[model samples]
Structures are given as C-alpha cells and as structure tokens.
Target chain A: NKTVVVTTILESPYVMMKKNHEMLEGNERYEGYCVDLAAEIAKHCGFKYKLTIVGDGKYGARDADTKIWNGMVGELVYGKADIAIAPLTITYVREEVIDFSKPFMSLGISIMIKKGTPIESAEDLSKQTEIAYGTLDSGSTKEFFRRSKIAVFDKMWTYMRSAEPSVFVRTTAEGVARVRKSKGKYAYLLESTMNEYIEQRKPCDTMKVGGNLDSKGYGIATPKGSSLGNAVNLAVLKLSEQGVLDKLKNKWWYDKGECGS
Target chain B: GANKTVVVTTILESPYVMMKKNHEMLEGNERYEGYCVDLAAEIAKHCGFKYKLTIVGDGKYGARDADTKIWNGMVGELVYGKADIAIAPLTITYVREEVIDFSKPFMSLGISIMIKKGTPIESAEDLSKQTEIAYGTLDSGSTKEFFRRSKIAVFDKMWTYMRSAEPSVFVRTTAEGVARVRKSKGKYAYLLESTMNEYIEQRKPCDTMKVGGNLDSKGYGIATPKGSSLGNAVNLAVLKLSEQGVLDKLKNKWWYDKGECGS
Candidate 1:
C-alpha cells in the first residue's frame, strides 16, 4: 500500500539500462514507455512505487514439467511484486492465472522483413524456397502457425520444422540481428508493437510486411484481485481517453520515426 | 518458367478492377486496366505464372440468394471452377471463408463516413445521435451489411433510424452514393468501405473528404477456391507485394498521384 513493488523486463523502449544507468541509483537507472507509464499510474493512484526487473527475463510461461512459473508473472503470483507492467500480452490462459489491466495498446503478430526484401504476406513465404523465415522460438506466433489447420500456415509450419540450418531464433534481438545480417534471406515474426518500434530505431533496415498473422493486445499486469487492480485499470483508461497514451506513443514510436512513414 | 495461363475471376469495382480508357482499342485481356488488373499482374509475375483476367459476368461481388442456394459474381465463377483465382476487393466474410481461402489482408480499412468538406459531422456518433444530416451505405456491399448487422449501441441505434428514414437510404452503386454526398450539400453522408472512400477523397471535385476513424476493422483480401493448390502461391505473392509496399504504392498511384485535393 505504501511503496508498490513492480516487476518488468529489460526490453528496449520498455526498459533499458541507461547510458548513465550504472551511475544513477535505483529507478533513475531505468526509463522507457513502461517507466513513464508506471510513474503516471503511481501519480494518478496516489502511491509511490519501486520498479524491479524480472530475474529470469522470461515473460512468464509455466514449465509444463514442474508446473512452476518463471518471469514477471511468477513474481506477481508469488507476491514478490504487486504490479507487473511491461509489454506482456493478455491471453485467455494468462488471465486464468493472473489479472490484467485493460489493454493500453493493441498489436498483432507481424512479419519483420529486412528493408527492400520482396516478402509481403505469409503466402509469399510459403511458396518460395529462396528466403527463409520463422518466428521467435516458443513464442505464440510459432505455436500459432504450428497449431493452425489453415493450408498456408500449416504449409509454413512444415517448412520451418524441416528446414536445415534452423529457422527459429531464441530471442527477439537475435532474430532482429539475423534480419540485418542475412541480407534479405531471413525474416523474423514477432509482435507488431515491437516490430514497429524496432522499425523506428537505429540503423533501421527492417519493415513490418503484410498484416499481422493474428490479432492480440498488450496490457499491464497485477496479482489476482489485488486491491490496486481496478484502480490501476481505471487509471489506464483515463490516460488513453485523455490522449496521454497516444502522446507517449508519439514520443517513443514516431518522434524519431527513422523509417518515418 | 511460365505455367499454362490461369484464368482470374474478378469484378469491376473501380480502382480494384476496371477497364482502361480507350480499352476499345485493345483486344482480349489487354482491354482492362485498374487496381485488380495491376494486382493480377504482380501476382503472376511473383508466382512465376501466366494468367488472364475475366470480368465477372454477373457484376456482383458475390452474394448467395436465400431463395435458391445459387451464388453469383466472382464467387460463382470460382466455385464452379470457371476461374483459378480472384484478385478483386472481395471481402473475407464468414460465409465466404467456409467456401474459399483468403490471403492475409493486403490493405487494412473499415467502414468510414464520407462527407462534403464542410459537413458539420465529426464522428459516426455525431450522425447516430441526431437526424438533421442523413446518412446511408452502399446498397449491397459490406458497408450496408455493416449497418444492417450492427448490434453495438451507436450503430444499432443508427440502424433503427436509417431503416425507417423518410426515403430510401441505400444507393445502388458507390459512385451514386458519392454523387449523392456531393450534391446533398452536407445534408447527406455516404458510408462506404474506407478503401473506396479514400480513393474518392483524392479524385477530382475534391469538395469532400473521409472523416473520422473507420467504424470497423476488416480488410479486403485476395480470395481463391478452398483447397486450391494455387492458393498458397497467390496468398504469398500478395504478402510479398504487401511487404514491398506495392499495395501502398498502388493506392497512391490510383488515389493521390493525380489527387485533385492539393496536398
């Protein structure tokens, strides 16, 4: 009720080690969309907060073998943190275990192709052997393509599973780096929000091609039925309606629209 | 290597598919030019194939009649195997999805309100809450279907108002609706697909513009017969073209390249 505990990830523009992060102490070392959002939420809700990085860096997936949770979701479930505010997606399964704020942002799984590459839609990749494509390993997108009965997606999954030299990337950054280095030979699939944000960053040479493969959105997280949950939910909707959410989006996503549309 | 020429079934939706000016001077497939025409060209080129576009004989996008289970327009041709592909602005509705395949959306848009430049309306909510300025959707396409099917508060309320309005509210063609919007002098608002709405926004007699965010969020897709082997290639080609920004380029080529509205 006093200094709220918040757990997040170190993903750029969400949370990053400031150039001066090491020199600064505590919350000052971190700044991003989540940081700003946390500050604004705390201000509106009348509470002080401490932001903590998730120890495992995982976005919270249950280990099927042990049924133990890891990542920020675990932090909140175990009461180590009262709030989990980051780019976590809101899913039906996730909601069964934790409470989520109304989505502050909406996005979908989209294709990230190096700039000037010919890939356009999932159909394009399915028919060609010249370019290799895959999604972040163990992410929903990979599973999305895997579980589908759709002809094209199933076709894509078949190709990804059998292709040599391995198609999937272990991390978003690795997939992104592969795109920059592969010279149009590889494409990475990830959330549209992240792909769009990366499209606006340094040495930009990638673009989100085709519509998202599917639809989803991101939300702030909190422990189930926490006292602050509904209050924080109203705070988010207020920010969005007042255009503060939009203003922050303009700051991070387009201010440097390096790939300026 | 070029395969045997594949027959493409499409409609005459302006910009998506239409005949060229002086098309009489040409013969066969050469006589046509428009959005679908160019899109077919891209699909063929990228898929390593040869194709010919044949306009739908019935002139409807595709609709199933309740009386007899017969289908018409491009959908009929695809179902009957008269064509191998459909590269028009055919919408991906549930009824259609059960029978055919659609590539991921190449263009994202929704139902939008088109008004004269000085129309007092600011949003769909504005038109819904009052009756001073009247609004209607295209007679038989997704836009009308949107209003007809809406159950959401704002739209459902507007649907009630529109259904029993003094005069008929639907226009037979989008062109007619656009004309009505222009001539109504801010008294009429035309609700149409955002794709066509924006294209008209850039054309001559630019006294009108699309206002407010689109009311819905579906997209126009490149559709093919369900289980067609060609579906994979055609779908991928659309995506590749999408990634290359060809869709946006073509939108500009047709919409703003000669935009009468000064940028």
Candidate 2:
C-alpha cells in the first residue's frame, strides 16, 4: 500500500492531545474531529497514511508581502504532505496554489459579546460611544471587516483600525478572554460556531450576539496536481451523504458535552 | 378609582419601540415607530382607553431574582403598581404566568438559528460537534431555561456544555447576540426566535441568514399583574388585531417593506 503523508494543525476538538497521549505511539496519541475524519478518508480511499502535525502549526495561509505559502498548505506545496486536513478555510488565493475538495463544512463570521452588552449591530456600536469591540488580528474575520464596502461595516472597520488602545487580538482565545473581563465594555467578533460552542461552556456570560458578518466554508486540501485530491473529495461527499460527517460532529460537540445541566 | 390614562410599560426591542430618526418634534406616542407602535394605537383605539406608551424603567422584559425574591423589568411595574399593563414582547412563561396574567400571545414564534450566510452549520448537530465555531441562546430567557431544565440526552448535554464553556457564551440580550453574529465573520451564530430571524433576514446588507428549524415554539404576550380589570379588555384588543389580520399586516409593514435586501 502506498503511504500518503498527512499534515494537520492542533485545534480543539480537531487534533487534540489524548488524556494518555504520553503512553501512546503513532496516531494513537491524538483524538478529535479531524483525526477521525482523516482515518475515514484514508480507509475509503484505499491508502495507508502517516499523520504528522504541521511543523509551523498553522491552518495554512500565504504571506502577502513575501508571496510565500506557509503552514500545512506550505507543507503540501513544498511536497511535505500529500493530504492536509484540519479545519482549513478555503480562500481564492489558496485555491490558486493548492487543490481543494468540496467544502466539508460551511461557516461565516459572527458576533461574540459579553452578556448584557448593548450591541445589536455594527451600526449600534457606531451610533453610541461606549462599548469597545475588536477582532482577531490574523484570521479571516479581520480580513473580511477590513475589505467590506457596506456602510455599517466600513464604519466599524474604520473605528477598529484607528482606535486608541487597539482592539485587535492576537488569537481567538485572547479575544474571548477580553470579552470575559471587559464587564460588558468589550465584544469579540469571531466565527459563529466557536461562539456558540463556548456559550455551552462554563461562565456562560458571553454569548453569540448577532448574525454573522459574512459567509464561507472550510474544505480539505491537497497539493495541486496531487492524485489523492479527487478521491478525498469523493470520500468527503460520500461521508457527508451518509451522515457520517454530522454523526462525527455529534460525537465531538454534543456527546459528553462537559458543562452542567 | 379611575385614572386619566393607562400606564402601559414596554421594553425597547427594535422595530417595537424604535426611537424615530427625528423624534424630537413628535409628542407623546408619536416619538416612536414600528409594528408595536401601530399595534399600541389599535389597542388603545379598541379598548377605549387613553394610554401613554412608557418605556419600562430598568429596561428588562421581566424576571424575578431567586436570591432577592425581587421581580425586575416590566413585571416590577405591574407588581408595584407602577404601570397598568405591559405591552411588550414578553414571553408567557410558567413563572411569569403564575405571578402575572398574560393576554394570549399576540405573536407566535419558535427558536431558530441565526447564521452567517455561508456559516458551515446546518443544525444543532453541527454546532454540538465542532470547536471551530461557538454558539449559544439567550442568557436569561425561555431558551436558556429550556436547556437548563432539559432531561433529554442531547439537550442535557448541551446545557452542561453551555454552563461551563469558557469566555461565557450566553448573550444577555437578543440584540447583543445578533451584533456578535454580524461582526464575528462566520465564527459566531445566534439562536433566537424565527419571527425576529425572518424580520432581520429582510434587513440591510443581508450578510447573515437564518437556517435550520426552530428548537421549540413560544409566543410573545402582553402581560398584566394578577386580577387586574384591564386583563379582559387588553386580551380582547389583542384578539381583535390578530383576527382582523392586523398583526399580519403589521409584520409586513415593518419587517419586509423597504427592506434593504430584495427577495
């Protein structure tokens, strides 16, 4: 059996450390949504796989100034891995350099706020002058807001870009932390799915405040011209139709959901 | 004892008690706009009562704190005899129903998912499984209560997760939740009633959209304190608006007309 090298990132519920990861070897040390997805994809595609975490631990994005690809996408483009599966969002620029399967899931940017915050829309934030808000500096959220043409969004984008203290956060966890401590003075704009997941967790004072700012989805990726590309796409579609993808989601998201009733 | 005008307490949810763009010139009831404003006019017309639209002080719909045994929001206005009736989108819950009287719900709606137009989620199942996104419902409302009280496996699991998930996932207000959705860029989604969902779906920019079926069904009612004489009259007025298709017309008037997004 030909071995397909795989690269992925370590994200919660995706590729997480097993409680006893120290005692395990090979792929047995990890468990999550993508770990299982990778296994399933490999089984259906009739290939053996060697799973490895991306060296840079990134979901894969390109550097605008250098025009260089990095992260798992980099690994594939550089012939580092045959398959990279870890909640990687599909973008036009990335598609130009790498091949992608049909989107495995759909998602969009949504709002996150501390409970009792008086924000309902970007226009709400712009009209009044109290609560401070921001987004992750490096993710798709900041990119989307920066490029929007709509008036409410444009207003929000301008406010964020020039605010005195700087609202941009380095990571999702950092933004969530600011929202938690701001005493209703801060709102963290992020992906809706992540906001909702946290809503079910402890200290549930923060909530997904409103509709998402925009829409997009994530897809599996392979190096351009890779032979495994079509088979992985078909495998995803097959699993999606059989409800395996959703079933797997239930396994990770809701089953044994750790918060209290 | 008779009063000159009924003190009607209302909460400020958008399209319900919106401050007119140029409200300064308007006097009394003319200072606001929306379906509720028009609905209030119809209720006052039919009930034969001179009514003043008063925004609820403390700005809450009504819920009692278990620690202090004190009722807050518009419910307090009725309990303390500050207002004669509450004409807002207050949920008719068992606790509120016990402490106060509710006119049969003037509007019916069920909880629905608010998602970014391309958000990768489709159902509660998707939300439950992934960590790439986070979600939640109202913090101090019927939806939260449902999750808290549920004995069902999936729902109970959700309640457990929501209770402890870090960075706090519950929004205090529906508007706040909607705000997060608009700014979060597919990372956030809100769970709310379809009535509001459908209303905003017709709103501007059209970036966000509602998907999936409702988690459950409930309606908004006008509440009055126990044994008030106005109960029967207010109920009668609400029924009239509903039966004459006035409620439907108002929905169209506020939610769909001049909508930024074309169908």
Candidate 3:
C-alpha cells in the first residue's frame, strides 16, 4: 500500500540534484538517467516509488572487519530501501549479499588524464612514475587494482599502495579535480561512463585516455528474497531490448553535452 | 570432491571446437583442438580437476522451447545434469541466467554483420530500408532471439522480413550462413557474433568481411549448473586468466597468430 523506496546515489548523469532543488519539493528536485529510469520501471512494474539517495553517499562496499555494507547496498541489505536503481556494479561479493538485474548499462574501468597528457595507455602509466595516478576509495576500480595479480597491474598496485601522501580520493569528483589541477601530473581511474561525461563538460580539460581496463556493467539491485526483484529485472531487459536505455543514455550524456561534439 | 572425471559439454563450432584431421586414428579429447579445447585445459589445470569433453547432443548453443518448456543443447546438458560444466562459446543471456550460472565473461563480443566484399550494405539500417539484399541470423541462437525480442525500429523491421522470407532466411548453422554469404553474389549477408565473423574473414578464400558497428554488446561465459560447487572457483579462474592476459594470448593463438590471410 506504500510507495517503494528506491536507494540511489548522487552521481551525475545517473542522478543529481536540480540546480534549483531548494525551490522544488520531493521527487521534482531531482532528474537524470536514473531518474527517468525509475519512472519507467515503476510504470512497467505497476507500482509507486519514492526516490531516496543513499544516506552515506557511497556506492556500497563491505567493511572487511565489520562485514557491514555501506551506501545503497546497505540500505537494501538492512531493509531501509526496497531497491537500488543507481550505478551499482555487480560483483561476487555484492552479489552474494544482494540480487542484481541484468546490466542496464555496460562500462569498463577507464583512465582520465587532463588534455595533452603524454600517456595513452595503462601500459604507459604502469611503467612511468613522473605522473602519479589513483582511484576513488572504496570503489570497484580501486578494488580491481588491489586484487589483480597480473605483472603490470601488480606493479601498478604496489606503487599506489606505497605512494607518499596517498593517491586515493574520497570520491570521483575529487579524483577528477586532482587530475585537472595537477596539469597532467595525475590521472584518475574511474568508470568509462563518468570519464566520458566529464570529458564533455565545461573547460574540457580532462579526457578519457586508453581503452577501458576491463569490461563490466552497472545493475539494478534488490535485497535478497525481495518480491520486487523479478519484475524489475525483467523490466531492465525489456527497456534494453526496446532501446529505451540507449535513448536515456544519449539524453543525459551526449545530447546535453556542454563541451560540444 | 569426487575423483570422477568431469563431463565437459561443448559444441563443434570451428575455431572453438572441431575434429582434428587425424580423428580417425586419435582417441578421446585428443581428437579435438581449438580455442575452447585449449581453454578447457587451462581451466581444468587451474581448478585442479580432470575432465572429459563430450559434444552437446543437439548441436545447439541452447535455447528454451516456448511451448514445451524444455531446454536443448549444452544448456540442457547442464540443466538435466548430463554435464558438469560447459566450456564453449556459449553466450550469457537473461533467460539463461535464470536457470544456470555463468562465470564472469571470459570474452566480450557483439552481434555483427558479415558481408561478401563489394556488398552495398554498410549498416543494419541500410539492410532494413531495402528488401533486395536479404539477411538473417543463425536459427535457435541469441542473434535470432535478439531480433525476435527487439522493439527497436530497425531490428524489429529486420526481424519481420527474416521471419517470413520465402524459402526461409534462417540458417541451421554458422557455417551454412558463411557459405550463403560466400556464394550469394552479394544478395545475402550473414549476421553472426563478431568473433566468428572476424575469424572466418581471416580464413581461406578470404572473400567476406565484417561491416558496420556491432548491433549490440554482450559476452561469452563458461556456464555451470546453478549453485554448483565449482562455480566460485571457475568464476575466479576466469578473472585470473583475464587479468593475466591469458585470455588475450589464447585469442591471438587461435585467431590471428594462425591467420592465413595477410595482415
């Protein structure tokens, strides 16, 4: 009898507060790819939903010692929200605790360097030390490097782990800001979606460099055994099959691009 | 775990799996050599298991029957407990994910078009706008299902033509589709996974080429029965190989390193 609670994050192009959010009330204060997606999902699943940003603003990673999940994942695991409709990555650890709809969007880890940077690939970055790099703390990109055993990645991870004053950032925005301010002295490892979006924003000082480090997808998440899981999962595939996902992507990422084609 | 040799199910697709020329004299797994055969060895070695490879009985990648609700092919083998695992170019799809488990993709691929050289078509939209040039996908596979289930304008239109084309447009196998493209004199094109399309483009005769950007993105995953004990280890092994660049090495070993066509 109540509206489903949707836990999302404030990732640009996926979800963001309206410029005049203070002037608006409730769901009217937010909009973007996921905002539009939530409406479509509710319509197809035949339910009313309330969009709530995850309290902690993290994407969700488990604490090794506490085993407690934080961010949107936590909201679902503890029953604070009925579902998560954000850019949450599907991984073995997270999947063991929650369920995910098939990928609504496929992406990969990508490198972002300020324009005119000398580097062109992960290999270039791995071999050099003059330009430093890092990933967002508690994110999949960081975890990928930390867990990889490949020789190049192992060397990269070793450098990152021991870098003085720390190379990691608390958020993607910080990482991007560091890259821009460093004048090619820093590169941020982030998902391609965000890297591409940032590349098209004003000033255009940053660009996604190199092919993606790896391929993966962002999924709609539901707590284990949640009744809403099945219908929403089908809806994601339906939207993808219908090209709705592609349209929404264009609407938020390219069609609204500020840096120009 | 029991000491029984694992029953590995696979399909007989070229460059993934095919009979050796000396098959008449060879016995067991020695009769085959391809990308999947090499991959099976790597996977089993990493997983610390001995296995036997058996061909899927139905010669399909696997599709669920709508009316009968029975799954056929390698998927059926796993679902009905005839095989312990499937190491082939099986695609990861939504419907299949419900009844079976797939490792994180070992290889990423997309549906692509294969055209004989000098064909006028350059994109899917070009194919949909005219009827003179006929095109179709493999029967009972994800490519066909993609069109059959699509709501996108161009794909839906293409599917309409394929479902009703006279004398039938769907081919029973990828080889048949490649043969159609090779012999059609530009009247017919074959739609297949980019991996296979590119592989064939590099083989003898070298008469066909992949054209246009891919229609969609997905991947090929090693599949196991849902909740199998081997699932976690297999999934990790795929990630390990991918990170170690072993998968890329295998791809080059099978596809490009042995290319007959000039680079």
List, residue by residue over B11-96, the lDDT tens digit for candidate 2.
Answer: 77877778998899888888888888888888888888888899877777666787998888888889888998888777666566
What does the lDDT read for residue B169 in candidate 2? Answer: 78
lDDT of 3 at B100: 89
Question: Which candidate gets the maximum DockQ versus the true structure?
Answer: 3
Q: Which window of ten consecutive residues has the lowest lDDT sum in model 2 chain B?
A: B236-245
lDDT of 1 by residue, B141-260 (tens): 556656666656788888888888888877777788889999998999988888898888888888888999977655577878878888767766765575444776787787777777
lDDT of 1 at A231: 72
In terms of TM-score, the best-performing candidate is 3
Better of 1 and 3 by DockQ: 3
Write the residue-wise lDDT of candidate 1 on A123-227 in tens digits. 999999999998775455665676666688889999998889998876688889999999999988789988999989878899899987665456788988788
Ranking by DockQ: 3, 1, 2
- Model 3 lDDT tens row, A61-118: 8898998988888899999999999988877677778887767888888999999989
RMSD of 1: 14.2
Q: Please list the residue runs of candidate 3 whose C-alpha ends up more than 4 Å from where it truly belongs after superposition.
A: A1-3, A64-68, A77-79, A224-228, B1-6, B38-50, B64-70, B78-81, B97-104, B224-249
iRMSD for each candidate structure, in the order shown: 12.6, 19.4, 3.1
Q: Residue B63 error for model 1, in Å?
A: 2.5
TM-score of chain B of 1: 0.91
lDDT of 2: 0.76
Each model's DockQ?
A: 0.04, 0.01, 0.30
